Design an enzyme around this catalytic site. Sequence first.
Site, PDB file in Angstrom:
ATOM      1  CE  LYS A 122      -3.217  -0.914   3.209  1.00  0.00           C
ATOM      2  NZ  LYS A 122      -2.949  -2.298   3.730  1.00  0.00           N
ATOM      3  CE1 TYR A 154       1.742   0.017   6.220  1.00  0.00           C
ATOM      4  CE2 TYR A 154       1.680  -0.005   3.815  1.00  0.00           C
ATOM      5  CZ  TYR A 154       1.420  -0.629   5.034  1.00  0.00           C
ATOM      6  OH  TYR A 154       0.800  -1.857   5.082  1.00  0.00           O
TER       7      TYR A 154
HETATM    8  N1  LIG Z   1      -1.315  -9.376   6.852  1.00  0.00           N
HETATM    9  C1  LIG Z   1      -1.149  -9.032   5.569  1.00  0.00           C
HETATM   10  O1  LIG Z   1      -1.656  -9.677   4.632  1.00  0.00           O
HETATM   11  C2  LIG Z   1      -0.330  -7.794   5.264  1.00  0.00           C
HETATM   12  C3  LIG Z   1       0.062  -7.526   3.946  1.00  0.00           C
HETATM   13  C4  LIG Z   1       0.907  -6.455   3.649  1.00  0.00           C
HETATM   14  C5  LIG Z   1       1.335  -5.630   4.662  1.00  0.00           C
HETATM   15  N2  LIG Z   1       0.944  -5.851   5.934  1.00  0.00           N
HETATM   16  C6  LIG Z   1       1.334  -4.853   6.986  1.00  0.00           C
HETATM   17  O2  LIG Z   1       2.148  -5.458   7.950  1.00  0.00           O
HETATM   18  C7  LIG Z   1       2.117  -4.655   9.163  1.00  0.00           C
HETATM   19  C8  LIG Z   1       1.970  -5.548  10.372  1.00  0.00           C
HETATM   20  O3  LIG Z   1       0.684  -6.166  10.248  1.00  0.00           O
HETATM   21  P1  LIG Z   1       0.417  -7.733  10.334  1.00  0.00           P
HETATM   22  O4  LIG Z   1      -0.577  -8.037   9.274  1.00  0.00           O
HETATM   23  O5  LIG Z   1       1.685  -8.491  10.419  1.00  0.00           O
HETATM   24  O6  LIG Z   1      -0.363  -7.825  11.748  1.00  0.00           O
HETATM   25  P2  LIG Z   1      -1.338  -8.913  12.419  1.00  0.00           P
HETATM   26  O7  LIG Z   1      -1.208 -10.234  11.732  1.00  0.00           O
HETATM   27  O8  LIG Z   1      -2.741  -8.328  12.331  1.00  0.00           O
HETATM   28  O9  LIG Z   1      -0.787  -8.891  13.922  1.00  0.00           O
HETATM   29  C9  LIG Z   1      -0.759  -7.752  14.809  1.00  0.00           C
HETATM   30  C10 LIG Z   1      -0.098  -8.188  16.098  1.00  0.00           C
HETATM   31  O10 LIG Z   1       0.107  -7.049  16.973  1.00  0.00           O
HETATM   32  C11 LIG Z   1      -0.679  -7.191  18.147  1.00  0.00           C
HETATM   33  N3  LIG Z   1      -1.216  -5.877  18.519  1.00  0.00           N
HETATM   34  C12 LIG Z   1      -2.232  -5.195  17.899  1.00  0.00           C
HETATM   35  N4  LIG Z   1      -2.435  -3.990  18.376  1.00  0.00           N
HETATM   36  C13 LIG Z   1      -1.529  -3.893  19.425  1.00  0.00           C
HETATM   37  C14 LIG Z   1      -1.315  -2.901  20.411  1.00  0.00           C
HETATM   38  N5  LIG Z   1      -2.066  -1.798  20.533  1.00  0.00           N
HETATM   39  N6  LIG Z   1      -0.320  -3.108  21.308  1.00  0.00           N
HETATM   40  C15 LIG Z   1       0.389  -4.243  21.233  1.00  0.00           C
HETATM   41  N7  LIG Z   1       0.236  -5.270  20.392  1.00  0.00           N
HETATM   42  C16 LIG Z   1      -0.756  -5.039  19.512  1.00  0.00           C
HETATM   43  C17 LIG Z   1      -1.663  -8.334  17.855  1.00  0.00           C
HETATM   44  O11 LIG Z   1      -2.170  -8.984  19.043  1.00  0.00           O
HETATM   45  P3  LIG Z   1      -3.353  -8.365  19.942  1.00  0.00           P
HETATM   46  O12 LIG Z   1      -4.519  -7.955  19.099  1.00  0.00           O
HETATM   47  O13 LIG Z   1      -3.602  -9.550  20.922  1.00  0.00           O
HETATM   48  O14 LIG Z   1      -2.695  -7.129  20.664  1.00  0.00           O
HETATM   49  C18 LIG Z   1      -0.823  -9.238  16.952  1.00  0.00           C
HETATM   50  O15 LIG Z   1       0.107  -9.990  17.739  1.00  0.00           O
HETATM   51  C19 LIG Z   1       1.008  -3.612   8.957  1.00  0.00           C
HETATM   52  O16 LIG Z   1       1.542  -2.375   8.486  1.00  0.00           O
HETATM   53  C20 LIG Z   1       0.155  -4.247   7.857  1.00  0.00           C
HETATM   54  O17 LIG Z   1      -0.469  -3.260   7.040  1.00  0.00           O
HETATM   55  C21 LIG Z   1       0.106  -6.964   6.289  1.00  0.00           C
HETATM   56  C1  LIG Z   2      -3.850  -6.569  -5.167  1.00  0.00           C
HETATM   57  C2  LIG Z   2      -4.535  -7.628  -4.355  1.00  0.00           C
HETATM   58  C3  LIG Z   2      -5.400  -8.722  -4.919  1.00  0.00           C
HETATM   59  O1  LIG Z   2      -5.778  -8.954  -6.056  1.00  0.00           O
HETATM   60  C4  LIG Z   2      -4.537  -7.556  -3.060  1.00  0.00           C
HETATM   61  C5  LIG Z   2      -3.979  -6.497  -2.173  1.00  0.00           C
HETATM   62  C6  LIG Z   2      -5.120  -5.752  -1.505  1.00  0.00           C
HETATM   63  C7  LIG Z   2      -4.535  -4.691  -0.619  1.00  0.00           C
HETATM   64  C8  LIG Z   2      -3.422  -3.873  -1.226  1.00  0.00           C
HETATM   65  C9  LIG Z   2      -4.929  -4.715   0.660  1.00  0.00           C
HETATM   66  C10 LIG Z   2      -4.219  -4.124   1.751  1.00  0.00           C
HETATM   67  O2  LIG Z   2      -3.291  -4.660   2.313  1.00  0.00           O
HETATM   68 CA   LIG Z   3       0.016  -3.078   2.504  1.00  0.00          CA
END
Ligand SMILES: NC(=O)c1ccc[n+]([C@@H]2O[C@H](COP(=O)([O-])OP(=O)(O)OC[C@H]3O[C@@H](n4cnc5c(N)ncnc54)[C@H](OP(=O)(O)O)[C@@H]3O)[C@@H](O)[C@H]2O)c1
Ligand SMILES: C/C(C=O)=C\CC/C(C)=C/C=O
Ligand SMILES: [Ca+2]
Length: 364
Positions: A122, A154
């Site tokens: 994103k 970000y």
């Molecule tokens: N997942 C994807 O598909 C994806 C894709 C691209 C980028 N990202 C990015 O990666 C980054 C990290 O996200 P993620 O997806 O890895 O996270 P996630 O799987 O949703 O995990 C979040 C973790 O942090 C904890 N947490 C949440 N709020 C908190 C708070 N206030 N204090 C302390 N701990 C807290 C959660 O447990 P509790 O709720 O028990 O606190 C959990 O352990 C974000 O910027 C997200 O946009 C994710």
């Molecule tokens: C581009 C795609 C699927 O087709 C998935 C990403 C969707 C997005 C960017 C969601 C946020 O993390």
């Molecule tokens: Ca993203």
Amino acid sequence: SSVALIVGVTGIVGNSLAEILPLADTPSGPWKVYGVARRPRPAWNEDNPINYIRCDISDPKDTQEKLSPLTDITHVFYVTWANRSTEVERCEANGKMLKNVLDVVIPNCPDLKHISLQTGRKHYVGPFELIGKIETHDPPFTEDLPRLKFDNFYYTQEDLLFEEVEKKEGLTWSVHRPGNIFGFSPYSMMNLVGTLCVYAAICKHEGKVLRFPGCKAAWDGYSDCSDADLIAEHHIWAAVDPYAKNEAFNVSNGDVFKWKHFWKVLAEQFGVECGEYEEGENLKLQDLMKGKEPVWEEIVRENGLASTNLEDVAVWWFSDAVLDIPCPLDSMNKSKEHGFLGFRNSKNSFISWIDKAKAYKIVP
Ligand SMILES: NC(=O)c1ccc[n+]([C@@H]2O[C@H](COP(=O)([O-])OP(=O)(O)OC[C@H]3O[C@@H](n4cnc5c(N)ncnc54)[C@H](OP(=O)(O)O)[C@@H]3O)[C@@H](O)[C@H]2O)c1
Ligand SMILES: C/C(C=O)=C\CC/C(C)=C/C=O
Ligand SMILES: [Ca+2]
Ligand code: NA
């Protein structure tokens, strides 16, 4: 000695970091590991020998209390976020969360070497509510093109990170940008594989065909994804390799696929009839799965599954936001040119993460 702070240890990446950091063959090991999250430690996170800490990092008082005693930290792995209704609110909530951690760890950790920050794709396509509605740079996305002229939490976190690391000499940073993550975490806010498994299980239970809840472009256009273990390895590589210091990197698997092909794999893994993309139809999981909580309880009871809440284990909005758009590709050239040659076969990764959800009795 290497001492890690995993901020978001029960998350889709935090849980991979909790399993990999303690391994004997891991670079800079043996690692001592602290893991932070707000909820009590779940059963599926217990198999890791980490020091689990309950802390709400949106609370400056709680952060000061739980983190100030952890003076031996050498590496920070920041793998968490907070969702809000608008991007401006996401900038305020996520900036504070990162600042609360850093304002405590930097003055209290004399051996602090690196801060690894996870962001995502994103960075290039824009916030949730602007994706598909703005002019972006052309894919494959490379790391050092200019930022979009719209707020993005970000960009807030990166600028906060850059100014935080100035407070300590020799302190380095890295930014990690995955696309859609294939991993394991029944607590993740964005878990495409886990959500799809629950969807496949409900279809199998109700004797319904595995209908594709997405757009034509997600079905037969090219897609990519970021394996959670591969992202964990990428965090570790950047944290210990001096040629990787002070750089942002994409982290995707090194191949491409089509949901049309992965649909067969998902159907076969749950013993369901493979449905396909239907040129009508605009199927949404948020609407299809409204009121399926009793059906999920039947599936839980009949198959001896761990007791889960449908809303935790299946984030319908996220699967819809993923499958209802094209998936523009990113580039792994910067990572590979810096010595990171890790990769994953995406279809094997997909099967591996489905099987992990089954092995922990989250799904049948
Ligand atoms: N997942 C994807 O598909 C994806 C894709 C691209 C980028 N990202 C990015 O990666 C980054 C990290 O996200 P993620 O997806 O890895 O996270 P996630 O799987 O949703 O995990 C979040 C973790 O942090 C904890 N947490 C949440 N709020 C908190 C708070 N206030 N204090 C302390 N701990 C807290 C959660 O447990 P509790 O709720 O028990 O606190 C959990 O352990 C974000 O910027 C997200 O946009 C994710
Ligand atoms: C581009 C795609 C699927 O087709 C998935 C990403 C969707 C997005 C960017 C969601 C946020 O993390
Ligand atoms: Ca993203
Ligand atoms: Na894998």
